[PDB]
Scaffold this active site. Structure first.
Site, short mmCIF file in Angstrom:
data_model
loop_
_atom_site.label_atom_id
_atom_site.label_comp_id
_atom_site.label_asym_id
_atom_site.label_seq_id
_atom_site.Cartn_x
_atom_site.Cartn_y
_atom_site.Cartn_z
N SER A 14 15.31 3.31 8.74
CA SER A 14 16.62 3.33 8.07
C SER A 14 17.80 2.35 8.70
O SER A 14 18.84 2.24 8.17
CB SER A 14 17.05 4.71 7.66
OG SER A 14 16.50 5.16 6.65
N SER A 42 16.84 -0.38 10.99
CA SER A 42 16.38 -1.38 11.61
C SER A 42 16.24 -2.63 10.50
O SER A 42 15.17 -3.04 10.11
CB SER A 42 15.08 -1.15 12.18
OG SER A 42 14.46 -2.15 13.04
N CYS A 88 15.41 -3.30 -0.41
CA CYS A 88 15.86 -1.91 0.14
C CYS A 88 17.09 -1.65 -1.27
O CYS A 88 17.95 -2.61 -1.09
CB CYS A 88 16.69 -1.90 1.53
SG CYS A 88 17.30 -0.50 1.73
N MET A 108 13.46 13.01 -5.36
CA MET A 108 13.00 11.89 -4.46
C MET A 108 13.27 10.88 -5.43
O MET A 108 13.36 10.70 -6.51
CB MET A 108 11.12 11.74 -4.71
CG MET A 108 10.49 13.10 -4.19
SD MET A 108 10.44 14.58 -5.27
CE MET A 108 8.83 13.91 -6.37
N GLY A 109 13.40 9.61 -4.62
CA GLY A 109 14.12 8.55 -5.41
C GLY A 109 13.28 7.80 -6.50
O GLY A 109 13.58 7.57 -7.72
#
Ligand SMILES: [Cl-]
Ligand SMILES: [Cl-]
Ligand SMILES: [Cl-]
Ligand SMILES: [Cl-]
Ligand SMILES: [Co+2]
Ligand SMILES: [Co+2]
Lengths: 391, 391
Positions: B67, B69, B104, B313-314
């Site tokens: 998350s 990097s 992302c 959950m996403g």
């Protein structure tokens, strides 16, 4: 308006030794935060991203570890003979708390560098090319730290080839001197530089038991059956060996007055440490890298929490440097004897240069300096943002 | 000189959703890094502090988690009907590798905000006060994302009272629309909006099996013996209950063609997910906070990896929004039926507003939008530093 914009606060984000911190000049802080207080604490909590129930610091500058949950204020010193006052706040990850009671020796390195980036040092003291002696008043504990910061082109020389364990990439070396550094009491609790340490069922061994950095029991590799070059694999897999070391450690604890009874040591595993020393000898690491005898002054191997350490513990590095500097200790003798105010020792994974100065008066030793090398670099500079209502 | 100073590169460090990333304008990068290549990859490795054998990112901008990097490049889009091209690099912690193949969705939120901080949006599109529709070309995968970014005083409105799970502090809501979003194949692998799902020894249950976000098997709370308000403690401590849910999950996997045999499910625990739905009902969380029926459109409870999830959950949030939007599904019906192109559902720890649009042609459904809300804020702005020789 209900939601004003964030405040922009001039800041520098630096790596100092093996920690990261957000650095501020006092004058750059909001007026309410220019004295100690609740506003300042709130501000730093918020910069860091604490208190965070997720323990992840996704909403701040923190990295959700103790090494990465730190803020620093530097200002021009009021203290005679000093360039900057250095204040360090440890921001709790999960509670709303900033602890001002400690020092971070790793972030000291960053304090010396930042003092120069921040324009807080008298320019009469800064060379175009050379070393700037930054005189730091550690404001948390009331002690002087001298940071010898290299300078090129009138600016901090950040880059270079000096390696520090726990720092991924090499950078320029900054030597630090902790003046009159301060489990207290005598440096030599037995009153002797070397004692005959009786270890029941194991033997009687020469030992230096020193309280400097951390209470440490030192013995000669040869006497206890070791070469001094040993790596982790040849010790940490043999419980019989490890049990034997613990017996020596317990014997020294007893003799140092740190425990009244041997069973007390079961629940006192952190101090004293136990290490063995030897004159220099070539050896290869587990990695495969060769250290030549000519490159080092002595070998040292230390155990922490019942296992051989991969390199050297920080406080134990201070004990080594201190003991090396005091003529007559086993560490001093292993390093060649005589004057040894700086020594480079070989540990399992490499070498480390440490130093000390100490003086004697009515048998009684006082440590006047601890000397070590670290590095620092700027990671990001500009402004941090926080909501204006957060503090 | 052997060690030149570090390079200063204009950058902005932002939280985007539940990730942190270092954001660059393409024009601010060193010339060698303004095209894809080894220099760019090296640069970002070094900004982040990778590759790091210590796995701690003490010497860079990274936080040593996936998350934290991440690096992002925005530029003015060449793509018709878009404001910015958005490129995202996932920097490996321990290997020298930057992966450009993904998106992302969390950092998308930051892309929309940064597009405005960076001056990359036509000012004809920016209000003094209102919403800026930032049209993002996700350059990694070739897809449009619309970020509705609030604006006050001609600048991004960052602060506010919108809460996002995993974000410690509330901030302003940014609604995202993923256009024509893309375990592929039909949205309804059985060809039906609702099926009679036979679960051997358990029962025969109405179920919607949908492949949208993630393959999910949905059932009605009431039919399978639940109220729809259940919290973790009343399910996750009863293996008999959990085994029963897994049987339903396996039955749906079989029926969806995701496994050929029930034993195959032992080693396929991630998909499909299993969730149960209900019309709205007041309930209290484990925390103690009350959610009123009037505040939500439906209740949803989902299991992941054999346990009731604490929120949602996403990818399962996308399945809910999609199923809600498609009239006739159990999720749509639980939400009241008819048109439900946005719904707020109650999960164990709170509520979440999601949305979708979908269209039908020869029985066959296509999802045209996924809609969700996130938030973003600037944490630090200015310049990152790296050694000039590092890339
Ligand atoms: Cl103020
Ligand atoms: Cl000042
Ligand atoms: Cl270049
Ligand atoms: Cl551009
Ligand atoms: Co070099
Ligand atoms: Co508010």
């Amino acid at each position: 308006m209900a939601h004003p914009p964030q405040i922009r606060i001039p800041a520098t984000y630096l790596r100092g030794g093996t920690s990261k911190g957000v650095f501020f000049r006092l004058e750059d802080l909001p007026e309410s935060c220019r004295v100690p207080g609740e506003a300042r604490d709130r501000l730093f909590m918020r910069v860091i991203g604490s208190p965070d129930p997720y323990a992840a610091h996704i909403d701040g500058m923190g990295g959700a570890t103790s090494s990465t949950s730190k803020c620093v204020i530097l200002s021009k010193s009021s203290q005679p003979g000093h360039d900057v006052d250095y204040l360090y706040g440890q921001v709790s990850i999960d509670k709303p708390f900033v602890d001002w009671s400690g020092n971070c020796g790793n972030l000291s390195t960053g304090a010396g560098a930042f003092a120069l980036h921040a324009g807080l040092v008298d320019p009469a003291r800064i060379p175009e090319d050379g070393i700037c002696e930054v005189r730091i008043w550690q404001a948390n504990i009331g002690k002087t730290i001298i940071a010898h910061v290299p300078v090129s082109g009138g600016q901090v020389q950040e880059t270079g080839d000096f390696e520090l364990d726990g720092v991924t990439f090499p950078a320029a070396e900054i030597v630090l001197e902790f003046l009159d550094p301060s489990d207290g009491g005598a440096i030599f609790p037995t009153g002797n530089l070397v004692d005959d340490l009786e270890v029941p069922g194991v033997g009687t061994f020469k030992a230096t038991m020193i309280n400097a950095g951390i209470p440490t029991v030192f013995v000669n590799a040869e006497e206890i059956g070791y070469r001094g070059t040993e790596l982790r694999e040849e010790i940490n897999g043999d419980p019989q060996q490890l049990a034997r070391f613990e017996r020596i450690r317990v014997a020294g604890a007893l003799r140092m007055g740190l425990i009244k009874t041997p069973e007390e040591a079961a629940t006192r595993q952190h101090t004293p440490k136990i290490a063995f020393v030897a004159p220099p000898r070539d050896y290869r690491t587990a990695s495969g890298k060769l250290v030549a005898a000519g490159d080092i002054d002595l070998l040292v191997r230390a155990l922490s929490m019942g296992k051989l350490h991969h390199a050297m513990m920080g406080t134990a590095a201070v004990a080594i440097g201190t003991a090396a500097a005091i003529p007559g200790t086993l560490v001093n003798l292993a390093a060649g004897g005589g004057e040894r105010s700086a020594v480079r020792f070989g540990h399992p994974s490499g070498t480390l240069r440490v130093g000390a100065e100490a003086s004697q008066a009515n048998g009684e030793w006082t440590v006047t300096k601890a000397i070590m090398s670290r590095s620092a670099r700027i990671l990001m500079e500009g402004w941090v943002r926080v909501p204006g209502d957060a503090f």
